[PDB]
């Protein structure tokens, strides 16, 4: 694509684990001569902070701000 | 009264064996090594079926209700007559098989030797005339046809001195030159090589594989370089690459990747 | 009515078709392992598949799908 070699972009739906701890995602195996790329984009969010469970793609549980 | 016939029969059966990758739907045992040269013994145990009273080297289907392809009868012995079967020298090249890790080589050349135990060494020329006549009778071109003196080598033997069949018959100067060096450390023998050197056509059963680093091309009005493709290997990456970068656009319908 | 056998030589006009479930392979530098491919048909689903999974990577320039 425009002189640069690319792999097809692959997508995952991610939420943070309870505890406000950072999220670990394993990097895809890149073919020899390519480097890993990553992008995160917002789907659903609220201001509930820790009082929420967004791990379901079909509904969002939001219990409000502390 | 069948020595001239038997030399060509065994040689052609040895040539047939040399051209088969699988025998009775099982891997050819001679392709299951990695050595560049191997000598197969004159006893022809390596050419007899495994399902024989004395086990040979040729594999069977396992179920003996099918007809088992064989090359020589089980009691066959060609260490007879003025031209006595002496063994065969196989030369190999390293080879890449898609489905058999024990297959590491493919056959480059086979030369089968027949030592002359005739009354006079000079008479090997006549014995040569009958075999060559029987070979040409059955449609076989004898490649580099020669009377030879062979000595043991690291693997099998090597030809100390060799003379063309034409020179043994038409040049008495050259003939006695050759019969002279025939001493006790050498064995006087006939060297029988068959044919098939030219390049190979791709077959509709796909049994024939492309050669390494070869390119499959299309005539295009684009000229050159933009119509070909190949399967490349990365010696460090240990990955096979299907190179289509010579094609500008690849247009498929359905598409999946991993 | 003619049929062609495995011994038939492949012609540059492509009039001779591969036998069903036969694999087009390369002698490759992989040692003892060829990198083959085939066009398979799946009776359940009635769909034709161009199987390249024996080759590790497929490297294209431009690429389009449907």
Residue numbers in the entry:
A (entry chain B): 292 to 357
B (entry chain A): 34 to 291
C (entry chain C): 226 to 291
What does the paper say about this structure?
The toxin-coregulated pilus (TCP), an operon-encoded type IVb pilus (T4bP), plays a crucial role in this process, which requires an additional secreted protein, TcpF, encoded on the same TCP operon; however, its mechanisms of secretion and function remain elusive. Here, we demonstrated that TcpF interacts with the minor pilin, TcpB, of TCP and elucidated the crystal structures of TcpB alone and in complex with TcpF. Repetitive TcpA units form the filament structure, whereas TcpB displays multiple functions, such as efficient pilus assembly, pilus retraction, and CTXφ uptake. The structural analyses reveal how TCP recognizes TcpF and its secretory mechanism via TcpB-dependent pilus elongation and retraction.
To clarify the interaction between TcpB and TcpF, we performed cocrystallization experiments with the TcpB-TcpF complex. The initial phases were solved to a resolution of 4.05 Å by molecular replacement (MR) using the reported TcpF structure and TcpB structure determined here (details below) as search models. The three TcpB molecules formed a trimer in an asymmetric unit. In addition, three TcpF molecules were found above the C-terminal domain 3 of TcpB. This feature differed from that of the ETEC CofB-CofJ complex, in which minor pilin CofB interacts with the secreted protein CofJ at a 3:1 molar ratio. Every TcpF molecule was a bilobed structure constituting an NTD and a CTD connected by a short linker, with little interaction between them. These CTDs were spatially separated without direct contact. The structural analysis suggested the existence of a TcpF trimer shaped like a flower with three petals and an N-terminal flexible extension, which partly interacts with the clefts at the interfaces of the TcpB trimer. However, the model building of the N-terminal binding region was unsuccessful due to the relatively low resolution of the present x-ray data. The TcpF trimer formed via an interaction with the NTD, where the interaction surfaces primarily consisted of hydrophobic and aromatic residues, such as Tyr31, Leu32, Ile35, Leu44, Phe98, Leu100, and Phe105, forming a hydrophobic core accompanied by some polar residues making a network of salt bridges between Arg41, Asp97, and Glu108.
